[model samples]
Target: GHMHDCHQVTVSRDVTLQNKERHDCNQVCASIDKETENKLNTDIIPRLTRYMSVKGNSIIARVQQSNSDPKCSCTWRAIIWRVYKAYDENSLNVALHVSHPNQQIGENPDWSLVISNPNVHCLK
Candidate 1:
């Protein structure tokens, strides 16, 4: 095992419906698609790399969310874990908060993974 300096990113966004369509779990989980992907590449990745000396290809990403009733709104989040492309089993309590459907513009982004970068120090 090696030592790594790791940090995490928490992005909260919302998904909304314009009509009376029922909230689909598939769509909620499926939010991690190209649009979101590109959004990360363009916005999130660059900043992390620039700030943390992170390698673009080494970052891991995943999404996690609550069990939705599908009849009403619920919560979810993107769990991003960043390390130097080297390693976790570390779990953190959920900190991101999503507002009630009636109180927010869109539902918070329903979203983790371990990421490693070359610049990351892997002291053995």
Candidate 2:
């Protein structure tokens, strides 16, 4: 029989929207310029990797982004989708949430999620 255990982890940080330029077009342009490289650094990838690292088991990630930025919404969605696709294609269960208000981005926004299948080994 396979047993599953779930645990909740809370990550808090101040995600500031300091320079709109940085958020506005910097990431979008970078994504176009070096889409592959930029994907590696984005929060979508690292967060999924971290989730998998903590729980030895694999994961499937579903990404949801803000609805406000109609013009660039697709850009953000694409970035997250690319990251999730890359991780998932490799047989990893990783998910991404863009609008969920991380410590840095939203007001009093503390992100929380459940990590299951606790038996993962850290990557080198």
Candidate 3:
């Protein structure tokens, strides 16, 4: 009924935090990355689905490269996806009410993760 007040703070929808670390992408870093990935898949994705469900807006998620990493490569992996919700030209964050809004969320139909009985649904 109401815009689920995130209090101007990103509850799980506008997640911008990244996991920073020096461990290489392999070896000792393996376990840590698993934990980090779980955190994101759990912390953000599901809740994001909730927002999308209520708003009827789809969200696009990505496993991005960390900015802190010296180079943009796989070695420095991180949590989190930039959940960009499908925006209608007429709608902005506060529902700007423009016309012909865009529904771009950068979805990768071919990309996916193989989780064993994941806690989150594949869709809303």
Go through the candidates in order and give the C-alpha RMSD of each one to the true structure. 9.3, 11.9, 13.5
* Candidate 2, position 29, lDDT: 32
Q: In candidate 1, what are the lDDT values of residues 18-121, reduced to their tens digit?
A: 32355555465465455556755664444334333344342333344444544433232343445333222222112122223355543213432232222345
Tens digit per residue, CA lDDT, model 2, 1-124 = 2322223222212122233443543343334434423443554346554433243222322233433331432222222111111133212321333434443443213222332223222332
Task: Compare the candidates by lDDT and give the number of the best one.
Answer: 1
Between candidates 1 and 2, the one scoring higher on TM-score is 1
Off by over 4 Å in 2: 3-33, 53-104, 107-124
**Model 1 ranges off by over 4 Å:** 1-19, 28-32, 54-124
TM per model? 0.39, 0.23, 0.25
Q: What TM-score does candidate 2 reach?
A: 0.23
